[PDB]
Design a protein around this ligand. Structure first.
Ligand SMILES: [Cl-]
Ligand SMILES: [Cl-]
Ligand SMILES: [Cl-]
Ligand SMILES: [Cl-]
Ligand SMILES: [Cl-]
Ligand SMILES: [Cl-]
Ligand SMILES: [Cl-]
Ligand SMILES: [Cl-]
Ligand SMILES: [Cl-]
Ligand SMILES: [Cl-]
Ligand SMILES: [Cl-]
Ligand SMILES: [Cl-]
Ligand SMILES: [Cl-]
Ligand SMILES: [Cl-]
Ligand SMILES: [Cl-]
Ligand SMILES: [Cl-]
Ligand SMILES: [Cl-]
Ligand SMILES: [Cl-]
Ligand SMILES: [Cl-]
Ligand SMILES: [Cl-]
Ligand SMILES: [Cl-]
Ligand SMILES: [Cl-]
Ligand SMILES: [Cl-]
Ligand SMILES: [Cl-]
Ligand SMILES: [Cl-]
Ligand SMILES: [Cl-]
Ligand SMILES: [Cl-]
Ligand SMILES: [Cl-]
Ligand SMILES: [Cl-]
Ligand SMILES: [Cl-]
Ligand SMILES: [Cl-]
Ligand SMILES: [Cl-]
Ligand SMILES: [Cl-]
Ligand SMILES: [Cl-]
Ligand SMILES: [Cl-]
Ligand SMILES: [Cl-]
Ligand SMILES: [Cl-]
Ligand SMILES: [Cl-]
Ligand SMILES: [Cl-]
Ligand SMILES: [Cl-]
Ligand SMILES: [Cl-]
Ligand SMILES: [Cl-]
Ligand SMILES: [Cl-]
Ligand SMILES: [Cl-]
Ligand SMILES: [Cl-]
Ligand SMILES: [Fe+2]
Ligand SMILES: [Fe+2]
Ligand SMILES: [Fe+2]
Ligand SMILES: [Fe+2]
Ligand SMILES: [Fe+2]
Ligand SMILES: [Fe+2]
Ligand SMILES: [Fe+2]
Ligand SMILES: [Fe+2]
Ligand SMILES: [Fe+2]
Ligand SMILES: [Fe+2]
Ligand SMILES: [Fe+2]
Ligand SMILES: [Fe+2]
Ligand SMILES: [Fe+2]
Ligand SMILES: [Fe+2]
Ligand SMILES: [Fe+2]
Ligand SMILES: [Fe+2]
Ligand SMILES: [Fe+2]
Ligand SMILES: [Fe+2]
Ligand SMILES: [Fe+2]
Ligand SMILES: [Mg+2]
Ligand SMILES: [Mg+2]
Ligand SMILES: [Mg+2]
Ligand SMILES: [Mg+2]
Ligand SMILES: [Mg+2]
Ligand SMILES: [Mg+2]
Ligand SMILES: [Mg+2]
Ligand SMILES: [Mg+2]
Ligand SMILES: [Mg+2]
Ligand SMILES: [Mg+2]
Ligand SMILES: [Mg+2]
Ligand SMILES: [Mg+2]
Ligand SMILES: [Mg+2]
Ligand SMILES: [Mg+2]
Ligand SMILES: [Mg+2]
Ligand SMILES: [Mg+2]
Lengths: 172, 172, 172, 172
């Protein structure tokens, strides 16, 4: 056993490794989405910028969990990062909808992680999740919902003008 | 023979003179396009600004080739600069499409020039073309493609509103 | 066909997608190595810092290739990012040796990519690889070789003192 | 009853008084350790500096708990501060090992305190412990573990050179 390990259940350790993979997966989804908008036949540079930033944030989320694993004396075990579900993201509205679904999926995993930490009476892990993950998720989900709403109201995805104007006035 | 000349084939010298003419031609096409947008019955000042800048860049491309010719000990031979294919450029979208076609034509000529330089084992000329021309062309073509895409998606050329808003938010 | 595509062979497009995956793989290897050194039973923070920086550089390499793909009118196709070969990296010396092997493997792939670009007479792609990848690889390989040499000379991996002092005076 | 008291169980009040004593005890252990390293026959000034800083931090931990007691309307009851277990701390490695054991003991007490607060549904007290104590403990334990590891790897306690170099390059 690690000399630092205390009150850190093996189930929690395993769940943290699963969460690391999921955060890296989310980084990959956003990376794919970003460069879709950089295509010459899509050409929405602020959608590209927005999703690249979200991608980099997800990687920071993963790295902080790796740091946590070591802080508590667990051992990092990495798995393949699966490719995203789509190669072609169809439209700005569709990409925002997929991002919303992704963030709610990552949130559900974080909530299950917190429930495990609660079941194992690990208040340090509970605090870590609450302080660094749960409100960030709520804010991300709200922002994506807001974006979906505006795109729908403006007439996307049929209106290429709506996508263009949203790119310029909300994402730029 | 020029006291400086070394490893510089007469075919390369001639091809450089042809490229000088083509770059000046491209400058002239963009000059014509620019002032079309300055017409009182067209009145898109940022289209005018954009194309005038592209015109001035083409002249810089020509002057750098003139400098190259002398650097290598070749002799500059100038020809008439042909007037552009159109007097009336029809719309912002049509002008962007013509610019895209022009830039791909200039690129093809540069690629043929590079192949000649390769065939004659002239690595200095190869480097000159690669370092100062080829990526600039790729970037210009990508930018023009992006512009065409947005104008089409926004509803041009039928939508005068699309042209106006593109002028203001992308070119301004 | 993409409106921007010119002189860009389908084989080159495919090879660029393969290179994107390899660069992301290299990012993952370095990420794994970094956090190994952050373990409480390893505890070499400058090894951790060094490898995390290398990880972030590899991701930048991947993103630039994604940008290239779109610039030339190719289409990005992503694959799973394989987990690294090891979970436990054994020592500072062993990790440096693995990094050296990785960088030489990535270099070989870049050289094969350049040979394809040469075979297809794509001087823009040749220049891109030469300007942004090949010297960076040569410098990385030389630096890693230098590091391996010093660790060996100092008495690693048997000397934990050698690893500690190298961490402090070369990597810090 | 205090005019401010609300949802503050008598068991929690008593447990806070016990924690105040333990934090002062930890301050005393580190004070003793610090001046051991200031002995002319030990003479490791950065070990002395490090432990004196840890001593002062423990006193701040105690004072914040005293403030908490009054904030919630409990009453502070003080007990003797026991002398540390050792007069002679043997070596830098041994002192770091004793500090690690101390911090894990203080952590266990904090975890028991948090469980009491949970059992009595006192979310303010739960938050206080999580926000101001639990991560500080995890970080302290990780840092001490890191220090023990490096000293062992470098050849302590037999190597007086290892202790000297660690003092200079990690603690200085
Ligand atoms: Cl445990
Ligand atoms: Cl367990
Ligand atoms: Cl997993
Ligand atoms: Cl796997
Ligand atoms: Cl699978
Ligand atoms: Cl998902
Ligand atoms: Cl349970
Ligand atoms: Cl709990
Ligand atoms: Cl919000
Ligand atoms: Cl908020
Ligand atoms: Cl919004
Ligand atoms: Cl507007
Ligand atoms: Cl010659
Ligand atoms: Cl000749
Ligand atoms: Cl001519
Ligand atoms: Cl003529
Ligand atoms: Cl003629
Ligand atoms: Cl043309
Ligand atoms: Cl020939
Ligand atoms: Cl050559
Ligand atoms: Cl570009
Ligand atoms: Cl570029
Ligand atoms: Cl555009
Ligand atoms: Cl092609
Ligand atoms: Cl082809
Ligand atoms: Cl692949
Ligand atoms: Cl795959
Ligand atoms: Cl496979
Ligand atoms: Cl490898
Ligand atoms: Cl071939
Ligand atoms: Cl070639
Ligand atoms: Cl070098
Ligand atoms: Cl160099
Ligand atoms: Cl070195
Ligand atoms: Cl009460
Ligand atoms: Cl009570
Ligand atoms: Cl007490
Ligand atoms: Cl007493
Ligand atoms: Cl007693
Ligand atoms: Cl103790
Ligand atoms: Cl109870
Ligand atoms: Cl509660
Ligand atoms: Cl830490
Ligand atoms: Cl932390
Ligand atoms: Cl340390
Ligand atoms: Fe975000
Ligand atoms: Fe951010
Ligand atoms: Fe995340
Ligand atoms: Fe997220
Ligand atoms: Fe330009
Ligand atoms: Fe310019
Ligand atoms: Fe040009
Ligand atoms: Fe041009
Ligand atoms: Fe590097
Ligand atoms: Fe760097
Ligand atoms: Fe790379
Ligand atoms: Fe590399
Ligand atoms: Fe030194
Ligand atoms: Fe401390
Ligand atoms: Fe401090
Ligand atoms: Fe404390
Ligand atoms: Fe402490
Ligand atoms: Fe809680
Ligand atoms: Fe909290
Ligand atoms: Mg998973
Ligand atoms: Mg699959
Ligand atoms: Mg328990
Ligand atoms: Mg918060
Ligand atoms: Mg001509
Ligand atoms: Mg004529
Ligand atoms: Mg020859
Ligand atoms: Mg260049
Ligand atoms: Mg591969
Ligand atoms: Mg596998
Ligand atoms: Mg060919
Ligand atoms: Mg270079
Ligand atoms: Mg006590
Ligand atoms: Mg006694
Ligand atoms: Mg109650
Ligand atoms: Mg906190």
């Amino acid at each position: 056993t690690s000399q630092v390990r205390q009150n850190y259940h093996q189930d929690s350790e395993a769940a943290i490794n699963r969460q690391i993979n999921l955060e890296l997966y989310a980084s990959y989804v956003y990376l794919s989405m970003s460069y879709y908008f950089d295509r010459d036949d899509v050409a929405l540079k602020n959608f590209a910028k927005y999703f690249l930033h979200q991608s980099h944030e997800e990687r920071e989320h993963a790295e902080k969990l790796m740091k946590l694993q070591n802080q508590r004396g667990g051992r990092i075990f990495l798995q393949d990062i699966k490719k995203p579900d789509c190669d072609d993201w169809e439209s700005g509205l569709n990409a925002m909808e997929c991002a919303l679904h992704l963030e709610k999926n990552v949130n559900q995993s974080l909530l299950e992680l917190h429930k495990l930490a609660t079941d194992k009476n690990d208040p340090h892990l509970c605090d870590f999740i609450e302080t660094h993950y749960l409100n960030e998720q709520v804010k991300a989900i709200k922002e994506l919902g807001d974006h979906v709403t505006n795109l729908r109201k403006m007439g996307a995805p049929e209106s290429g003008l709506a996508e263009y104007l949203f790119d310029k006035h909300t994402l730029g």
